């Protein structure tokens, strides 16, 4: 086994990002057994990213759990190779061994280039990766066997470089959140354990590199209604006597002359009686602010009924005994109250100031750190409100709230105005064997968290992308917002609390279901007492239950009555049993894994219909491909990721290698195969080409600019790098370059892709044209034809299999015993499938 | 966002008279004050007279010897002239603007934070 930990260190960048590029760690290990189990135990050091880095104890990717550097969103060193796309490359170090005890592992990151860098027990590792993809953010990771012991050395507070950091990197240990703390978590987990037993969780949620960027309304532009000298310079005034009053409070004092040291101020006069730049500046405060209330849903009213008058200015204490004092208060908190609205619209106001601030900030070059670095400009606070902690929060909120208060007793009448949905959901069901379909069962759920939680009975063909309730297959509950779902939704009992436990009693023999609440029965509008009843009992059903995201909870089948809780206050005198009670081990569970994979075309799918025509007149066996309710009702439009079920593999070694020719037809080694695009299907929207084994990009809103790309540049001691291999997934090109080098046409686009298995170039062509992009391969390589559509028309696409003159169809790539057949003929085994976001684990 | 080019305060001896012309290019919105701070080398960053919109000066204990700073900020213009010198004068100049308020900022840490660096000069005395 491996198990992957990481340091709890997120960095990344993105366009005006607050976090610094350059960073790096170090890492001791101490203790290790040469080989685990016989076998050389596994160890590997690297980074990894946030979204796409998901390792699985037990049936991964290749032949095992990826862990680290087995994909393309994980990087890693193992002592003689790094680790990347699942593809172990060997790198040249000057000490060159297997990591051992007492041995110091050097890792640096730059966010701003993409480049990482590793260095064994002070040996620089001379390849490095380059060029991948730098979202999100990146995060230290080591990856180990059973029977070994290290360190991790992030510098500063945790840790201590054994080497001097390389010039321009700071220690990572300086990109710690404040609201969190530093620790040794796993990356992503479907379970968790506690006292009471095995708590089930969703996944866990993560920030985006777009997130921390500030985006505010700038209100400078907005005219204001002549209130500016009729009641704004009362709100000036107002102001002012606060902010005198504050500072008699503290030892600030009102000197003759400024002195920031004596405590002085610089006008020292009752009335403020600033000069130009102050005053101005303090009437354009009021002024920004009704600027914000009017460019928000807020109007503003200067009508009082002379409220300036009943406002009680007589609140001196004569605590003052400077030449600036005397601010009264009008008791305007008393006069009017601050409502909910108000209070909001302060936050509003509050935040978006401060996100006008952070965007100037981040103009000017500042960007977020650990601590206050003035000379670096570097500010904790310069993050959005949103994101900003409690405490500068409320420091620049009291002001609003004055200001606000202000208004009220001034009477302004203003009113304030995809890919996720599967990683946002987690199905928990039972094995279908343990079916039942006769007695009454019991068991029990508990909420440990409140939210986001639907307990309940469901068949054993449980539908992995639709949620629980929705389909008639499933009796659930949502508790948390007090609701069952077999079709839609239905209030029946009251939401639970923290830490409460629902009872789910399913009738089998009275065909009825009851959900109770910490033994309380749920009641409905006419009291109906059972959940559910006139139940078929078909197939039988299941302890189901659906978590969200992160969130945890004790699923207890009720194997031991011990344990079991509430069954002796519903259940017991009932007649319900609980379920597998006899027993002796766990009963075992099936979970919705989300991972994409693809997926045969099903015959029946709603949109998309797959026919296939061999031995056509002039064209080769092809397999068709047409949208269904295209032009009609209920007719939807989503992206399409096709690949087929055969790919082609490349020869181990790359040793170069009308009437057609014969012997050139002996000869080749390169392979044909074309896509006809029917007419009234955009070009723009339509892609042919292949993907590796290791795809798993289901974005809807796929670009060729999308595709993932990594360079392995192995280099030498003197940093003359000597290799440049650049790796990808998928080699498909786009439509919209074809059809723009030439409305609807009646001739249908004809796209003709080259593969060459000996040499170890792909290359395309369109309509007879040339296409500059060609694409470089190494040995050892299978290759699936995929194709990315968008449909937008009745009849999308048809996939030709055939040959050309003096080049071999497919086929004989495709079959070893039929490598010498020049007759195009599409395997039986061969099938399209389509790319499916969510299985069954 | 303001850049403030400093020059001046080339090496001399003591009694030396080392003008340091300094501008504050950028936008003539929040011109109101204007800041100077000395990085001695290895030592403790003191603040140098300061001088804020209205021709205002407040000054420091770094201020000992002869300090004729004549910054304006009609062209944000810094003319800190040093005619005397001491050997502990040997510091790095800078040249900060912002736009606080006559020394006071009566909304707080947001408008204090809004402070624009500059390059500053090397003063080296004998």
């Known amino acids: 086994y491996v198990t992957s930990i990481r340091p709890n260190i997120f960095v990344g960048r993105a366009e005006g990002s607050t976090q610094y590029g350059k960073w790096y760690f170090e890492v001791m290990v101490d203790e290790v057994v040469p080989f685990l189990t016989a076998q050389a135990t596994h160890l590997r050091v690297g980074w990894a990213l946030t979204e796409g880095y998901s390792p699985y104890p037990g049936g991964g990717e290749g032949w095992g759990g990826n862990g680290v550097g087995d994909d393309l969103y994980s990087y890693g060193f193992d002592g003689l190779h790094l680790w990347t796309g699942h593809v172990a490359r060997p790198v040249t170090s000057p000490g060159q061994h297997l990591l051992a005890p007492e041995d110091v592992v050097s890792c640096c990151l730059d966010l701003s280039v993409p480049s990482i860098s590793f260095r064994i027990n002070g040996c620089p590792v001379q390849g490095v990766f380059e060029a991948f993809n730098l979202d999100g953010l990146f995060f230290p990771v080591v990856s180990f066997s059973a029977g070994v012991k290290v360190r991790f050395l992030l510098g500063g507070r945790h840790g201590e470089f054994k080497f001097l950091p390389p010039p321009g990197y700071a220690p990572c240990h300086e990109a710690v959140l404040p609201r969190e703390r530093l620790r040794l978590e796993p990356i992503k987990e479907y379970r968790r354990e506690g006292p009471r037993g095995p708590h089930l969780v969703g996944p866990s949620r993560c920030l985006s590199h777009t997130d921390f960027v500030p985006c505010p309304v700038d209100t400078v532009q907005i005219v204001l209604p002549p209130h500016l000298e009729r009641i704004r310079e009362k709100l000036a005034e107002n102001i002012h006597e606060l902010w005198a009053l504050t500072r008699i409070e503290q030892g600030w004092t009102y000197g003759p002359v400024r002195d920031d040291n004596k405590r002085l101020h610089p006008c020292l006069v009752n009335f403020h009686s600033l000069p130009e730049p102050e005053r101005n500046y303090n009437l354009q405060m009021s002024g920004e602010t009704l600027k914000t209330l009017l460019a928000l849903g807020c109007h503003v009213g200067m009508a009082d009924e002379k409220a300036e008058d009943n406002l009680k200015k007589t609140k001196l204490p004569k605590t003052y005994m400077m030449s600036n004092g005397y601010k009264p208060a009008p008791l305007d908190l008393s006069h009017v109250r601050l409502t909910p609205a108000q209070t909001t619209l302060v936050d509003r106001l509050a935040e978006n100031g401060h996100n006008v601030w952070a965007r100037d900030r981040v103009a000017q070059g500042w960007s977020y750190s650990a601590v206050q670095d003035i000379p670096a400009r570097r500010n904790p606070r310069l993050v959005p409100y949103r994101l900003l902690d409690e405490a500068t929060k409320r420091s620049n909120r009291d002001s609003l709230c004055q200001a606000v208060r202000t208004l009220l007793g001034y009477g302004y009448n203003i009113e304030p105005p995809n890919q996720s949905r599967w990683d946002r959901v987690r199905i928990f069901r039972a094995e279908k064997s343990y079916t039942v379909q006769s007695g009454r069962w019991y068991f029990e759920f508990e909420a440990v968290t409140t939210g986001e939680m639907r307990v309940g009975w469901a068949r054993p063909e449980l539908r992995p992308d639709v949620e629980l309730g929705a389909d008639e297959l499933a009796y659930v509950f949502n508790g948390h917002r007090g609701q069952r779902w077999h079709l839609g939704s239905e209030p029946f009992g009251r939401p639970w609390q923290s830490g409460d436990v629902v009872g789910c009693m399913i009738d089998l023999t009275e065909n009825t279901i009851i959900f109770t609440l910490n033994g309380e029965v749920l009641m409905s509008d006419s009291g109906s007492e059972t959940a559910f009843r006139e139940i078929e009992i078909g197939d039988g059903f299941l302890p189901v239950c659906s978590l969200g995201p992160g969130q945890v909870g004790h699923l207890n089948l009720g194997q031991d009555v011990s344990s079991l809780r509430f069954f002796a206050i519903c259940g017991l005198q009932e007649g319900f049993e609980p379920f597998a009670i006899n027993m002796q081990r766990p009963v075992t569970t099936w979970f919705s894994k989300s991972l994409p994979q693809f997926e045969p075309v099903p015959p029946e799918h709603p949109h998309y219909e797959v026919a296939r025509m061999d031995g056509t007149v002039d064209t080769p066996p092809c397999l068709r491909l047409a949208h269904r309710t295209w032009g009609s009702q209920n007719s939807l439009v989503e992206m399409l990721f096709l690949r087929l079920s055969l790919p082609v593999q490349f020869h181990q070694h790359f040793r170069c290698t009308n009437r057609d020719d014969p012997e050139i037809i002996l000869n080749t080694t390169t392979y044909y195969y074309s896509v006809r695009v029917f007419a009234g299907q955009e070009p723009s929207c339509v892609w042919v080409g292949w993907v590796t084994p290791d795809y798993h990009q289901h974005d809807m809103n796929f670009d060729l600019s999308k595709v993932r790309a990594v360079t392995v540049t192995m280099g030498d001691e003197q940093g003359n790098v000597h290799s440049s291999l650049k790796c990808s997934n998928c080699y498909m090109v786009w439509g919209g370059d074809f059809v723009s080098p030439g409305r609807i046409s009646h001739t249908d686009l004809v796209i003709g892709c080259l593969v060459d298995l000996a040499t170890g170039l792909m290359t395309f062509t369109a309509n007879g044209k040339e296409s500059n992009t060609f694409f470089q391969v190494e040995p050892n390589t299978k290759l699936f034809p995929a194709v990315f559509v968008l449909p937008t028309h009745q009849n999308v696409i048809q996939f030709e299999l055939g040959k050309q003159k003096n080049i071999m169809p497919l086929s004989a790539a495709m079959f070893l015993s039929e490598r010498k057949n020049p007759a195009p003929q599409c395997p039986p085994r061969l099938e399209v499938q389509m790319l499916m976001p969510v299985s069954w684990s | 966002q303001v850049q403030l080019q400093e020059s001046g305060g080339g090496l001399m001896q003591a009694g030396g008279s080392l003008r340091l012309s300094c501008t504050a290019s950028?936008?003539?919105?929040?011109?109101?004050?204007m800041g100077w701070y000395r990085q001695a080398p290895g030592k403790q960053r003191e603040l140098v007279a300061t001088?804020?919109?209205?021709?205002?000066?407040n000054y420091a204990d770094s201020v000992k010897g002869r300090f004729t700073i004549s910054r304006d900020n009609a062209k944000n213009t810094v003319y800190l002239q040093m005619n005397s010198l001491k050997p502990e004068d040997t510091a790095v100049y800078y040249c900060?603007?912002?736009?606080?308020?006559?020394?006071?900022?009566?909304?707080?840490?947001?408008?204090?934070?809004?402070?624009?660096w500059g390059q500053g000069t090397q003063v080296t005395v004998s």
């Open positions: 900060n603007a912002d736009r606080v308020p006559n020394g006071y900022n009566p909304w707080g840490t947001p408008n204090d934070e809004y402070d624009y």
């Open positions: 001088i804020t919109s209205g021709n205002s000066i």
């Open positions: 950028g936008s003539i919105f929040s011109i109101n004050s």
